[PDB]
Amino acid sequence: IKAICTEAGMFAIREERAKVTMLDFTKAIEKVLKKTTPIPDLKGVMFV
Amino acid sequence: QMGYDRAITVFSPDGRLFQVEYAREAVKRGATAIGIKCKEGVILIADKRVGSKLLEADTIEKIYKIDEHICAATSGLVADARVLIDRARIEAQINRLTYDEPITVKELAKKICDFKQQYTQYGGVRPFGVSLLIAGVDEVPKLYETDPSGALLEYKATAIGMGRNAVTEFFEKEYRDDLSFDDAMVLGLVAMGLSIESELVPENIEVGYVKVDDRTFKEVSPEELKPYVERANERIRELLKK
Amino acid sequence: QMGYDRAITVFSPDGRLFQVEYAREAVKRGATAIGIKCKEGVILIADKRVGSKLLEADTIEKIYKIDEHICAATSGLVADARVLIDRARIEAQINRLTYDEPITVKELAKKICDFKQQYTQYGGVRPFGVSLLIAGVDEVPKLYETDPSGALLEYKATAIGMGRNAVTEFFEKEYRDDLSFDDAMVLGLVAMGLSIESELVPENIEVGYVKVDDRTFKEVSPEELKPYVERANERIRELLKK
Amino acid sequence: QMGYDRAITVFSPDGRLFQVEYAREAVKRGATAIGIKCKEGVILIADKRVGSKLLEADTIEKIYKIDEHICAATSGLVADARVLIDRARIEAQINRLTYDEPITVKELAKKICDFKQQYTQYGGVRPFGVSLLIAGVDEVPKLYETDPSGALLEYKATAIGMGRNAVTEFFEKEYRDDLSFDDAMVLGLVAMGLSIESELVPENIEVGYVKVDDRTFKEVSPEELKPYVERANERIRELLKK
Amino acid sequence: QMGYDRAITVFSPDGRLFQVEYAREAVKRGATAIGIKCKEGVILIADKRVGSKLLEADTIEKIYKIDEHICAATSGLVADARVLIDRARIEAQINRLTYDEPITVKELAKKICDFKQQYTQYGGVRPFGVSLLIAGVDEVPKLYETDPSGALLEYKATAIGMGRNAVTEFFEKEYRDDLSFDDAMVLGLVAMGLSIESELVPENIEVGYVKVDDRTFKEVSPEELKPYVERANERIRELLKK
Amino acid sequence: QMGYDRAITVFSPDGRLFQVEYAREAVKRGATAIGIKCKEGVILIADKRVGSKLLEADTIEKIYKIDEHICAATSGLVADARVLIDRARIEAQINRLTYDEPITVKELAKKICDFKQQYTQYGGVRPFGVSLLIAGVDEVPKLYETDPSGALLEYKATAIGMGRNAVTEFFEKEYRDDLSFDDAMVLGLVAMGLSIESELVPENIEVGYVKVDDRTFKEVSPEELKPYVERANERIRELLKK
Amino acid sequence: QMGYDRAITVFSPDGRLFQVEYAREAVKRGATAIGIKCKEGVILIADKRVGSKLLEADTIEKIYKIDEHICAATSGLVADARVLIDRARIEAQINRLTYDEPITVKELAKKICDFKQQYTQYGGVRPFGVSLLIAGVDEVPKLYETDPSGALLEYKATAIGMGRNAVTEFFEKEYRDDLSFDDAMVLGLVAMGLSIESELVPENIEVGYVKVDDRTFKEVSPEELKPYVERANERIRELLKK
Amino acid sequence: TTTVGLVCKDGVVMATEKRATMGNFIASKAAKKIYQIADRMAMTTAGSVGDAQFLARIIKIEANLYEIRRERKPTVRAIATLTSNLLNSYRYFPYLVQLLIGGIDSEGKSIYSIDPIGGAIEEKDIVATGSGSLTAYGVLEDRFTPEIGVDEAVELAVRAIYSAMKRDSASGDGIDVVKITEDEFYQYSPEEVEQILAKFRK
Amino acid sequence: TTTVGLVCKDGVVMATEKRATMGNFIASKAAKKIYQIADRMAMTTAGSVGDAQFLARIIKIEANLYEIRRERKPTVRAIATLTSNLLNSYRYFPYLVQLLIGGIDSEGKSIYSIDPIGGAIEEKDIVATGSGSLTAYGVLEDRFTPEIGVDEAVELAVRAIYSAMKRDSASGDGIDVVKITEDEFYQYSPEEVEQILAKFRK
């Protein structure tokens, strides 16, 4: 969680701000998920 | 757990069948299907939500005609449900053949539960990972939920699928026992709206029902969904802001 | 871990083969049913408390007609119950087809035990995880317990499921063979009361009886159960003070 | 480990069957039985003293009439007994169907074992962890014990169940082959008394016999049993003071 | 993940069958096959691309005819396709036996997904691991993807295979319900050429199509693909510069 | 890999059935069988050297007769070769029984693939560990390779077994369709030279071919082989000056 | 590689059946049998040597006639040979039943091999544990070796069992194609002596042969084994002096 | 032999003759042709005794099993159709029986006439069955009243059988009548029934 | 025992005479011999009541199974073939019956004649079938025009069978018309029919 917070603030810098918002958060989270998920929920198309 | 979940034959010292529960975790992957039973008819509302705009909306449905005054929904595998429910058609048919009396909704449920039950006992073949909602009206409305075991539970308001926990919470609060066909219909559109977590368009949902007077199955056209859906959207937006 | 409960074709070195005692643990987890034997009949009581107001307060059933002079009550999976209760009703009738004699409680009991043991013995199929109470009056009142093992145990009065131990203690003290139909009925309603650690209201229990002087099954009507319960609640309350 | 004991179609490196050796101990895990042969018939005595006042004194039973003039006791798992004795009885009348011959005691047990041979060889099915003692008079008295494996041993006096080891020792000094029917009947009881470690009450233990004058199965009700028991009870007292 | 993929009976804890998951990868390893349905018919195009000139001019066979106006094409395991398709032809002939009507694409699809479903239930037989796009014109054009799971899904333009993802993205922008017969089939060639990442020639694509206006299936010669291919190359080129 | 390969039933994360592809490794070890098509017939050349010289290696034999215009060569188990060829033989003669037509090259291949495949999907039985090339001229040259999977790939020249590697890499440069009957027979004989890495003797090799203008399988005697072998031996030696 | 060897439905990742490799080692824990082909017939010899004199070597057989012009020898389990030669006898004769023709050596070798392949498809049956050498004269002498794998190979001199290696090195030097009956016989005897590492005694060897000239099987008594065994034994002495 | 049935608004009233006469023969002193399927359901047969009795055991056994299954009383239709089907599946063992399976349920009162080729068909008025049926119709159709009770219905069931008996030699006596007034299952039994025709002769 | 059928221009009309008698029991005279397959599909029978209703019930059940499973109304040709294949199934015992299956479907109006053994052939607009077949063809075809409607088609149906009845004596009086216009599936029953032909015969 401490690394994700750090990713988000860094994301803000890339977006030319000092404001951290929800889209900065969502990418920051994904970066960490990339590592340790993906687990496919694409098998939900085979379930009614 | 650890080999006492890797065959269906097993038991656990918990006294669970973990294999059946995993079969029930299959029901919870698929989408919500919700039923209400009221004194003037029975209401069936299914998710028809498409993953894409290249997916055809016509069949991805849950709702199956079974009898003249019986429809049903399914949650679980698609594959399992159509084979299982084509069995419920046959069964309804057998009854009409040999007694010349259309199958009651209760008897039907006992028969198709026992069919799932040979597949739960047997080791050589898996159970289905499906629950049904079997809704019909025989003389007066009836609503049952079939478990993946084959357990049979009578209900008056029920859900299966992914959206289920919130729909359980919802019918605690909201549902009343003096409500009509029209009033309980809208409420089930607010409940489908809750579970999918948006204000419904009437082209990602499908309604079938059976009234006592009509004593028929009908399927609700897009033209005919809209007054319920518009009424719904008003109360659905309020729960997505509060 | 044990490795003696992978299949029912394994035995323990202990002699208490574990996989059918894990079919026993399945029963215990399930919710209660009590059989109480008197000299003027037998009385039989089972849960109907199940679920909240989503669920029916008229959930069918735990208190099965098997005959029009034999009843049965259950604990364990109501799925495993379903198929077994089906076989019971045909079997009982099968005695009738080939003799035109009412099957006695003892003879009915031995046949369901034999059915259970087909599934128990084969290793390519699991036992039923359900126990049965069979109550009738053939012309002497009789009460048996049939184990998920398909083993036969006779009792003066007995209970199964979560409340087994509370009732067990309850009848240990109080149960006599000199109880009348009224006395024994109210005593078993006290004992059911204790099992769920709560009062009894007439929709949480279904109660049936087989009378001596009629030898026919009749189910006590909801408002007809209300005066037994009314006197029972007094006592259940005294003991939940403790 | 050890075994090589999760399959019955696999022998241990000793060459033994762990699975059957294990199923032999389940006879022992269940209740005692005492069989005694004398020269004026054969008495089979079965333990029916079990559980508290919650059970009826009749607890089934444990001493089935197999044929007119042949009876058997059971020790071990009840479920397994129920089916074993079913086949036993049907085979006893089958001999009369094809030969019009009262089945020999000897042949009946050999075929009880032959059924059980099949469930020891074929891995598709469990062994029965149950042992019957087979007492009758074909025209001389004979006492056998049938085993889970299907091994077959003629005795002239025996115990099985809980008292198997204890009572073998009792009978090295005490038992002779010059005992009277009455003496024998009392001595099988002293030993039974030895097994539970307590005075016997005839109101919960069941005795049958086949004499050589009779050639018919008879059963001893508790009023009759009283003087036998009174001569046993002095000796059970003598034993439990040393 | 582990132990939930060693048979088709077992479910994993999320309610997913990991055996079944590996079966979608089975679809995705194999060659791309695209279907594009329009008002005037339904066109089914499948990759005929060969990794050698030592394979046949037409390698037999990527697009099967399975009834008068019903065709399917394959992706995934092409070994299983031979059996799957042997069956699909027979089922569509069968309905012509027993009602002497052209089978509808939907009911044909249901029946083949029952034949998968049959090998899914049994744990002795492993399931189909190939996906077919069954396309035909009945009352109106219809197009399905029948999955290894035994599920049908209807789409209005579709894909499966290697190229599966790329052609979902392409049609999301480019496909519309305003597309002519010609504008559609041509659009599938564009879809196919991106997929292989090469200009198309007639020997690396196989086309059939279904007309409404003829109400018959035809299989288009490599010669009469030549104009459409030419038209297609411009768009493919632009796409491969993007 | 592991665990996705010690059964037939298992799918791997790749989607492949490694079990079947390991029976293609059973083929792969021993020996060259070569097929080469041309526009004036099809020529099937096969290895026939087996062990040392005690072994008679002028018989046993890959080029089995199957019809009057159908022949197949084998690579892989000799054990599997006999039954599969025998079935093949059965299916050929079924077409004559029932249509009074010699069966077509395509259909025999199609069928015998389906037969191998049936056996792939069943568990507790394996697919055949042998591969054939199906050579025939119905009215047209065809050359097929039928796989131990039960898939069908038509080639215009291929090889299976040990020599597969050599003949592919050779046919990249050499193979063309401008070959005649003669140019193909010598050219496939060179192909086989490279595969065993030696000069040919017409003693250790055997050729059958199906010509369009005879419509016969004919089996070439070693005196007849020899002229063609002279043509080839000079080519094979220049190519083993690499 | 480890664990691709405990089923026969299972190929290993290296391509090879190691299960079969372990079935060819059972032959080699048997006693050698040598077959040698001459122009004047076919001679079959077998090691009747027995490890003691409490067994009677003469009766213990080794070498059985199969047809009136085909004989066969075994190596491996006695047990598996009994099923296999009973197969053989019935099959040889079945040819005579429906064609009235004494079975051809190739053809019997083939039909026994197809039997042995069938026990190698299914994992439910243990593959054979013997090999036969099939030697008769149909119209020409043939001398086959059948393999437990269910393969057949033509040989002109061969062995099976533990001596297989040594008889190969021996016949590699001294085997000729131009041998007479008397010379072949001698040569085979010499060779058996190398394998046992010691002299021959008439009383622990069996020799049976089928001449081309006569086409009747005849079996060599100890009396008539004598001339041949002096001449052979001098050579063994010399050869195993080195 | 001959059996009669009529549908009243107060019940269903049917009649049998227990004796089955070839033409002079006495099959049995008394036998059963009226089978009690429920207190509201009846089975009255004309045909063979043995097939009728055989089918009846099955049916009695399935009426009570069907009741326990729906937890709802058997309908008249549901027993009728079962017998049509039971006959056609088990026809491998020959059947020569006509059945009249009738009674009372929520829908009203009705009789279904079943022939051994199959069939179950709705009757709300008049039905008669057997070799005496042709004569029986003559009587029943002239004297039918729609508003008729069970009280005048017994008099008629008597009159109808009584004429078949006096003009068929193959029609035995021992006339039993069953009445199902929706309150009980009364059997008059032979002795009273014989006295109904005592006042129609003399 | 004779049946007729005609396509009008807008419905299918079939008619069946009630009077079936086997021995000394009249099976039909007040009970049906036409069964409902689907809403506007019927099947008419000439032959025994028992055979006709037992076989029709299966076809009726499977007609429902068709409708529901595939969401497609079955055609006259669909029901027709199915019936043919089932008459193949059992033919060990009596199962020889002459069926006419017709009505309205979503490809027009059709009648199909199903032979006793199996097989199905089509009839443009006139059928018969029965033993009155020869008399019926005349009456229907003379008064059949391409432009006849359902009202005057029901009148005709009665006229073909009642002119035929006279030459026959496997048939008697009592007749049912069925009219299938796609606005009603009405079963005329004896009362009504006797009254319409009371004006067209006297």
Short mmCIF file of all heavy atoms in Angstrom, two decimals, chain B residues 3-4 9 11 13-15 37 114 117 120-121 123 154-156 171 175, chain C residues 5-6 19 25 29 53-56 58 77 79-80 82-83 124-126:
data_model
loop_
_atom_site.label_atom_id
_atom_site.label_comp_id
_atom_site.label_asym_id
_atom_site.label_seq_id
_atom_site.Cartn_x
_atom_site.Cartn_y
_atom_site.Cartn_z
N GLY B 3 -7.49 -32.64 -0.73
CA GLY B 3 -7.85 -34.02 -1.11
C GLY B 3 -9.15 -34.42 -0.63
O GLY B 3 -9.63 -35.57 -0.85
N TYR B 4 -9.83 -33.49 0.06
CA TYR B 4 -11.14 -33.74 0.66
C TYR B 4 -11.98 -32.62 0.20
O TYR B 4 -12.82 -32.10 0.89
CB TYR B 4 -11.24 -33.73 2.19
CG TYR B 4 -10.29 -34.71 2.81
CD1 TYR B 4 -9.52 -34.38 3.93
CD2 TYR B 4 -10.32 -36.04 2.35
CE1 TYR B 4 -8.61 -35.30 4.48
CE2 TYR B 4 -9.46 -36.97 2.97
CZ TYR B 4 -8.61 -36.62 4.03
OH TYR B 4 -7.74 -37.53 4.62
N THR B 9 -16.77 -37.75 -4.05
CA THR B 9 -17.06 -38.93 -3.31
C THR B 9 -16.83 -38.59 -1.82
O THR B 9 -17.59 -39.06 -0.96
CB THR B 9 -16.07 -40.15 -3.73
OG1 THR B 9 -15.97 -40.40 -5.11
CG2 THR B 9 -16.60 -41.45 -3.10
N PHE B 11 -15.93 -37.03 2.03
CA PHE B 11 -16.32 -35.99 2.90
C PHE B 11 -15.11 -35.34 3.56
O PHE B 11 -13.95 -35.75 3.41
CB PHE B 11 -17.24 -36.49 4.10
CG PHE B 11 -18.62 -36.71 3.62
CD1 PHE B 11 -19.01 -37.90 3.04
CD2 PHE B 11 -19.58 -35.73 3.97
CE1 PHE B 11 -20.39 -38.11 2.61
CE2 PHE B 11 -20.90 -35.89 3.56
CZ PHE B 11 -21.32 -37.06 2.90
N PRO B 13 -13.97 -33.84 7.60
CA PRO B 13 -14.44 -33.82 9.03
C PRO B 13 -15.18 -32.58 9.53
O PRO B 13 -15.72 -32.53 10.63
CB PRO B 13 -13.20 -33.94 9.87
CG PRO B 13 -11.96 -33.93 8.96
CD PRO B 13 -12.52 -33.81 7.49
N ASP B 14 -15.26 -31.59 8.67
CA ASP B 14 -16.17 -30.47 8.90
C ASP B 14 -17.58 -31.05 8.66
O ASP B 14 -18.56 -30.73 9.35
CB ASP B 14 -15.98 -29.33 7.81
CG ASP B 14 -14.77 -28.50 8.23
OD1 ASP B 14 -13.69 -29.06 7.91
OD2 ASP B 14 -14.92 -27.36 8.72
N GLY B 15 -17.76 -31.96 7.60
CA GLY B 15 -19.04 -32.61 7.37
C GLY B 15 -19.68 -31.83 6.26
O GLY B 15 -20.86 -31.83 5.95
N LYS B 37 -42.54 -13.44 -5.26
CA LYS B 37 -43.76 -14.22 -5.41
C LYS B 37 -44.78 -13.33 -4.77
O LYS B 37 -44.49 -12.72 -3.80
CB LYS B 37 -43.70 -15.50 -4.62
CG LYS B 37 -45.01 -16.32 -4.74
CD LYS B 37 -45.09 -17.71 -3.93
CE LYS B 37 -45.34 -17.42 -2.44
NZ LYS B 37 -45.63 -18.70 -1.73
N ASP B 114 -34.04 -34.10 -7.70
CA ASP B 114 -33.68 -35.51 -7.49
C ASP B 114 -32.83 -35.95 -8.65
O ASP B 114 -32.04 -36.93 -8.52
CB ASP B 114 -34.93 -36.35 -7.42
CG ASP B 114 -35.36 -36.72 -6.02
OD1 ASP B 114 -34.62 -36.39 -5.05
OD2 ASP B 114 -36.44 -37.33 -5.91
N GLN B 117 -29.53 -34.81 -8.06
CA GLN B 117 -29.12 -35.59 -6.96
C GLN B 117 -28.45 -36.87 -7.28
O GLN B 117 -27.65 -37.36 -6.47
CB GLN B 117 -30.32 -35.85 -6.12
CG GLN B 117 -30.16 -35.12 -4.70
CD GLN B 117 -29.15 -35.80 -3.73
OE1 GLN B 117 -29.36 -36.92 -3.18
NE2 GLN B 117 -28.10 -34.99 -3.42
N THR B 120 -24.84 -35.95 -7.77
CA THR B 120 -24.13 -35.45 -6.61
C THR B 120 -23.60 -36.61 -5.81
O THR B 120 -22.44 -36.65 -5.45
CB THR B 120 -25.09 -34.73 -5.66
OG1 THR B 120 -25.85 -33.72 -6.42
CG2 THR B 120 -24.31 -33.95 -4.65
N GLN B 121 -24.51 -37.65 -5.74
CA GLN B 121 -24.11 -38.89 -5.13
C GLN B 121 -22.96 -39.55 -5.94
O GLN B 121 -21.94 -40.02 -5.40
CB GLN B 121 -25.15 -40.04 -4.97
CG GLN B 121 -26.39 -39.56 -4.15
CD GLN B 121 -26.09 -39.13 -2.76
OE1 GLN B 121 -26.71 -38.21 -2.28
NE2 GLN B 121 -25.16 -39.85 -2.01
N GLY B 123 -19.90 -40.61 -8.28
CA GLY B 123 -18.48 -40.27 -8.26
C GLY B 123 -17.97 -40.20 -9.64
O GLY B 123 -16.88 -39.70 -9.82
N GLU B 154 -38.36 -23.53 -0.16
CA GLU B 154 -39.51 -22.63 -0.57
C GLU B 154 -39.23 -21.20 -0.13
O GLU B 154 -38.73 -20.99 1.00
CB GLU B 154 -40.90 -23.08 -0.13
CG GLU B 154 -42.08 -22.42 -1.02
CD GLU B 154 -43.39 -22.92 -0.51
OE1 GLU B 154 -43.39 -23.94 0.20
OE2 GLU B 154 -44.46 -22.29 -0.88
N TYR B 155 -39.54 -20.19 -1.04
CA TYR B 155 -39.25 -18.79 -0.87
C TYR B 155 -40.44 -18.01 -1.31
O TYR B 155 -41.41 -18.51 -1.88
CB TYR B 155 -38.10 -18.44 -1.80
CG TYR B 155 -36.78 -18.82 -1.08
CD1 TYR B 155 -36.03 -19.92 -1.47
CD2 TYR B 155 -36.23 -17.86 -0.30
CE1 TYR B 155 -34.64 -20.02 -1.15
CE2 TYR B 155 -34.91 -18.02 0.20
CZ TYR B 155 -34.12 -19.13 -0.28
OH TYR B 155 -32.73 -19.12 -0.13
N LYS B 156 -40.38 -16.69 -1.00
CA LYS B 156 -41.42 -15.77 -1.35
C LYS B 156 -40.70 -14.65 -1.96
O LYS B 156 -41.41 -13.83 -2.49
CB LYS B 156 -42.07 -15.43 0.00
CG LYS B 156 -43.35 -14.52 -0.05
CD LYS B 156 -44.08 -14.64 1.26
CE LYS B 156 -43.54 -13.58 2.28
NZ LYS B 156 -44.38 -13.72 3.54
N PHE B 171 -34.60 -6.98 -0.01
CA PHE B 171 -35.93 -7.45 0.12
C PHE B 171 -36.27 -7.58 1.60
O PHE B 171 -37.48 -7.55 1.97
CB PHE B 171 -36.16 -8.85 -0.51
CG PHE B 171 -36.32 -8.83 -2.04
CD1 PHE B 171 -35.86 -9.88 -2.81
CD2 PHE B 171 -36.95 -7.74 -2.69
CE1 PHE B 171 -35.89 -9.89 -4.19
CE2 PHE B 171 -37.04 -7.77 -4.10
CZ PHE B 171 -36.48 -8.80 -4.83
N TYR B 175 -39.36 -4.84 0.69
CA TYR B 175 -40.51 -5.64 0.14
C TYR B 175 -41.61 -5.63 1.18
O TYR B 175 -41.29 -5.62 2.31
CB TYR B 175 -40.14 -7.14 -0.21
CG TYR B 175 -41.29 -8.00 -0.64
CD1 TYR B 175 -42.02 -7.78 -1.84
CD2 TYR B 175 -41.70 -9.09 0.20
CE1 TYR B 175 -43.10 -8.62 -2.22
CE2 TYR B 175 -42.72 -10.02 -0.19
CZ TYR B 175 -43.35 -9.78 -1.43
OH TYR B 175 -44.37 -10.67 -1.84
N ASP C 5 -10.14 -41.72 4.81
CA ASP C 5 -11.44 -41.15 4.62
C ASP C 5 -11.39 -40.46 3.24
O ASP C 5 -12.27 -39.67 2.91
CB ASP C 5 -11.96 -40.18 5.71
CG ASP C 5 -10.82 -39.40 6.28
OD1 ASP C 5 -10.34 -38.39 5.68
OD2 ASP C 5 -10.27 -39.85 7.40
N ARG C 6 -10.41 -40.94 2.41
CA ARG C 6 -10.38 -40.61 1.00
C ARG C 6 -11.51 -41.24 0.23
O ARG C 6 -12.16 -40.61 -0.60
CB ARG C 6 -8.97 -40.90 0.57
CG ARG C 6 -8.68 -40.27 -0.79
CD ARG C 6 -8.87 -38.76 -0.96
NE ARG C 6 -8.16 -38.04 0.18
CZ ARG C 6 -6.85 -37.70 0.09
NH1 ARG C 6 -6.20 -37.65 -1.13
NH2 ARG C 6 -6.21 -37.43 1.30
N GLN C 19 -14.96 -42.13 7.10
CA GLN C 19 -15.68 -41.41 6.01
C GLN C 19 -17.18 -41.49 6.17
O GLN C 19 -17.93 -40.67 5.66
CB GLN C 19 -15.31 -42.10 4.69
CG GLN C 19 -15.92 -41.59 3.44
CD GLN C 19 -15.27 -40.32 2.96
OE1 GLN C 19 -15.20 -39.30 3.67
NE2 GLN C 19 -14.73 -40.43 1.68
N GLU C 25 -21.23 -36.40 10.75
CA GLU C 25 -20.96 -35.03 11.05
C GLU C 25 -21.75 -34.08 10.22
O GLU C 25 -22.25 -33.09 10.74
CB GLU C 25 -19.42 -34.69 11.04
CG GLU C 25 -18.89 -35.40 12.32
CD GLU C 25 -17.43 -35.03 12.62
OE1 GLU C 25 -16.54 -35.18 11.71
OE2 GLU C 25 -17.23 -34.61 13.76
N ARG C 29 -24.58 -30.93 11.88
CA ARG C 29 -24.52 -29.56 11.41
C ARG C 29 -25.85 -29.10 11.00
O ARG C 29 -26.13 -27.89 10.95
CB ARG C 29 -23.51 -29.25 10.27
CG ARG C 29 -23.62 -30.18 9.09
CD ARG C 29 -22.77 -29.74 7.78
NE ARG C 29 -21.39 -29.41 8.13
CZ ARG C 29 -20.64 -28.52 7.40
NH1 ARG C 29 -21.05 -28.03 6.16
NH2 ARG C 29 -19.42 -28.10 7.85
N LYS C 53 -37.51 -13.55 6.24
CA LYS C 53 -38.82 -13.30 5.67
C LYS C 53 -38.65 -13.34 4.14
O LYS C 53 -39.64 -13.35 3.39
CB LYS C 53 -39.33 -11.92 6.04
CG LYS C 53 -38.30 -10.77 5.86
CD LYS C 53 -38.54 -9.89 4.59
CE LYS C 53 -39.98 -9.28 4.52
NZ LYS C 53 -40.00 -8.19 3.55
N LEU C 54 -37.41 -13.52 3.64
CA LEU C 54 -37.23 -13.88 2.28
C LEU C 54 -37.78 -15.33 2.08
O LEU C 54 -38.77 -15.51 1.39
CB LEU C 54 -35.80 -13.87 1.79
CG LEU C 54 -35.25 -12.52 1.26
CD1 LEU C 54 -34.87 -11.53 2.34
CD2 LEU C 54 -34.12 -12.74 0.27
N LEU C 55 -37.17 -16.26 2.78
CA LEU C 55 -37.68 -17.57 2.94
C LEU C 55 -39.15 -17.64 3.34
O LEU C 55 -39.57 -16.76 4.11
CB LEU C 55 -36.69 -18.47 3.73
CG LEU C 55 -36.36 -19.80 3.11
CD1 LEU C 55 -34.86 -20.18 3.35
CD2 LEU C 55 -37.19 -21.00 3.58
N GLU C 56 -39.89 -18.70 2.82
CA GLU C 56 -41.32 -19.04 3.30
C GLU C 56 -41.34 -19.46 4.76
O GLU C 56 -40.48 -20.25 5.19
CB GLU C 56 -41.99 -20.16 2.42
CG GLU C 56 -43.54 -19.95 2.31
CD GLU C 56 -43.86 -18.90 1.25
OE1 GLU C 56 -43.17 -18.76 0.26
OE2 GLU C 56 -44.94 -18.24 1.37
N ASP C 58 -43.83 -21.19 5.55
CA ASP C 58 -44.59 -22.35 5.07
C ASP C 58 -43.63 -23.17 4.18
O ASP C 58 -44.01 -23.76 3.14
CB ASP C 58 -45.84 -22.10 4.19
CG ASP C 58 -46.83 -21.55 5.25
OD1 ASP C 58 -47.24 -22.29 6.16
OD2 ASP C 58 -47.23 -20.38 5.13
N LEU C 77 -28.38 -33.04 5.02
CA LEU C 77 -28.71 -32.41 3.79
C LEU C 77 -30.14 -32.78 3.33
O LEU C 77 -30.60 -33.91 3.19
CB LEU C 77 -27.85 -32.85 2.54
CG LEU C 77 -26.35 -32.59 2.62
CD1 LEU C 77 -25.70 -33.54 3.54
CD2 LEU C 77 -25.66 -32.58 1.17
N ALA C 79 -31.11 -32.12 0.44
CA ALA C 79 -30.89 -32.69 -0.85
C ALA C 79 -30.89 -34.20 -0.82
O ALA C 79 -31.68 -34.88 -1.61
CB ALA C 79 -29.53 -32.30 -1.43
N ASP C 80 -30.18 -34.79 0.17
CA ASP C 80 -29.90 -36.24 0.29
C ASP C 80 -31.13 -36.85 0.86
O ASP C 80 -31.45 -38.04 0.66
CB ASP C 80 -28.72 -36.56 1.19
CG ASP C 80 -27.45 -36.10 0.56
OD1 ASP C 80 -27.43 -35.76 -0.65
OD2 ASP C 80 -26.39 -36.11 1.27
N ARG C 82 -34.02 -35.80 -0.10
CA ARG C 82 -35.08 -35.74 -1.07
C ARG C 82 -35.30 -37.00 -1.80
O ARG C 82 -36.42 -37.45 -1.95
CB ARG C 82 -34.97 -34.53 -2.00
CG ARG C 82 -36.23 -34.09 -2.75
CD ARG C 82 -37.46 -33.68 -1.98
NE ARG C 82 -37.19 -32.48 -1.05
CZ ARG C 82 -38.02 -32.02 -0.11
NH1 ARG C 82 -39.27 -32.56 0.11
NH2 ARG C 82 -37.65 -30.95 0.61
N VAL C 83 -34.24 -37.62 -2.23
CA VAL C 83 -34.15 -38.85 -2.97
C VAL C 83 -34.41 -40.01 -2.11
O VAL C 83 -34.97 -41.00 -2.56
CB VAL C 83 -32.80 -39.10 -3.62
CG1 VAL C 83 -31.60 -38.82 -2.60
CG2 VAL C 83 -32.69 -40.42 -4.51
N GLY C 124 -17.58 -46.09 -5.61
CA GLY C 124 -17.66 -45.25 -6.77
C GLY C 124 -18.82 -44.31 -6.67
O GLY C 124 -19.24 -43.70 -7.67
N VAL C 125 -19.33 -44.14 -5.37
CA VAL C 125 -20.51 -43.34 -4.98
C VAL C 125 -20.44 -43.11 -3.50
O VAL C 125 -19.88 -43.90 -2.76
CB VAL C 125 -21.82 -44.03 -5.37
CG1 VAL C 125 -21.97 -45.33 -4.60
CG2 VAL C 125 -23.00 -43.10 -5.17
N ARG C 126 -20.87 -41.96 -2.91
CA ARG C 126 -20.72 -41.62 -1.51
C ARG C 126 -22.03 -42.00 -0.73
O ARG C 126 -23.00 -42.23 -1.46
CB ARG C 126 -20.42 -40.16 -1.38
CG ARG C 126 -21.63 -39.24 -1.64
CD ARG C 126 -21.24 -37.76 -1.66
NE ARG C 126 -22.39 -36.97 -2.21
CZ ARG C 126 -23.46 -36.67 -1.48
NH1 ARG C 126 -23.57 -37.07 -0.19
NH2 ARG C 126 -24.45 -35.95 -2.07
#
